[PDB]
Amino acid sequence: NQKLIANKFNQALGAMQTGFTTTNEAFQKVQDAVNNNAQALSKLASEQINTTLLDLTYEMLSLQQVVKALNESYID
Amino acid sequence: NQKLIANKFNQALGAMQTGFTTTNEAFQKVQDAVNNNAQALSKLASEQINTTLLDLTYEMLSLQQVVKALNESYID
Amino acid sequence: NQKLIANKFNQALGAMQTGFTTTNEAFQKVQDAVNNNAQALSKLASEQINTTLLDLTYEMLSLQQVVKALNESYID
Incomplete structure (x- = not known):
């Protein structure tokens, strides 16, 4: 075990990257929906x-x- | 120290799990609020x-x- | 390499902290926008x-x- 530590660390890094990528994707969708619905509200108000x-x-x-x-924290 | 590394890593893993769980919970609430308010807008428009x-x-x-x-990156 | 592991781990920790800080900042903005636009909708409806x-x-x-x-998982 030093090889097992490095394996678990690389494995965790992969999960962390997916989590932040997914979070980033979700925020983009939230921004688009909130802004579309704000513009719809403004239009209705007019x-x-x-x-x-x-x-x-x-x-x-x-x-x-x-x-x-x-990505730069991976262990070969 | 190899035991101290493993301890800090497990400790960090626990924090990472909480962060993504919490993020997931927040996104659920954001989805519900945005969609409720979109339907309210649609109804008002009608x-x-x-x-x-x-x-x-x-x-x-x-x-x-x-x-x-x-969870699968934890060190016994 | 035990020093290289610790370096990559500290480096990753810094990235994880930034990610959750940034996520937290984004959620604050989402909350403010959604709630402002909900109150605007309520006012328009009245x-x-x-x-x-x-x-x-x-x-x-x-x-x-x-x-x-x-922060508490860093390695000196």
């Missing part, structure tokens, strides 16, 4: 009003970099 | 309109599998 | 209706604790 748009550009790019960074 | 529903089925199941996968 | 508010207090605090817990 036919206060203070709606807000979601912008998660920074967060989504940051999650992508996190998955990238994890 | 009384363009292009509202969108959130479906994060794939992402939430994927997060569950990630937490499952992490 | 001028069923069953809108829902998002509260991710537990999840956001939990993510903060996860980042805290990860």
Whole structure:
């Protein structure tokens, strides 16, 4: 066991990468839905009003970099 | 120290599992709220309109599998 | 290599902390946008209706604790 540690660590890294990739994908969908429905509300109102748009550009790019960074922790 | 490495790794794994479980729980709530409020908007409009529903089925199941996968990286 | 394992592990921990911090930040923004737009909808309706508010207090605090817990897995 030093080889077994490295195996479990690489294995965990793969799971962590999937989790943040998936999280990033979910946030994109949330942004699109919230913003579509905000614009629909604004349009209906035209036919206060203070709606807000979601912008998660920074967060989504940051999650992508996190998955990238994890790639560099793998053990050959 | 090889025992201390394994301890810190198991400890980190526990934190990672909690994080993705919590993230998964939050996404479920976001989906429910966004969709409830989209349906409320559609109903009000009936009384363009292009509202969108959130479906994060794939992402939430994927997060569950990630937490499952992490379980398999523990060191006895 | 035992030093290389510890280095990659610390490196991965840093990435994991960033990911959950970023995720936590994104959820805060999602909560604010969804709730602002729910209140806007309620106001427009006043001028069923069953809108829902998002509260991710537990999840956001939990993510903060996860980042805290990860800090304690670092190897000197």
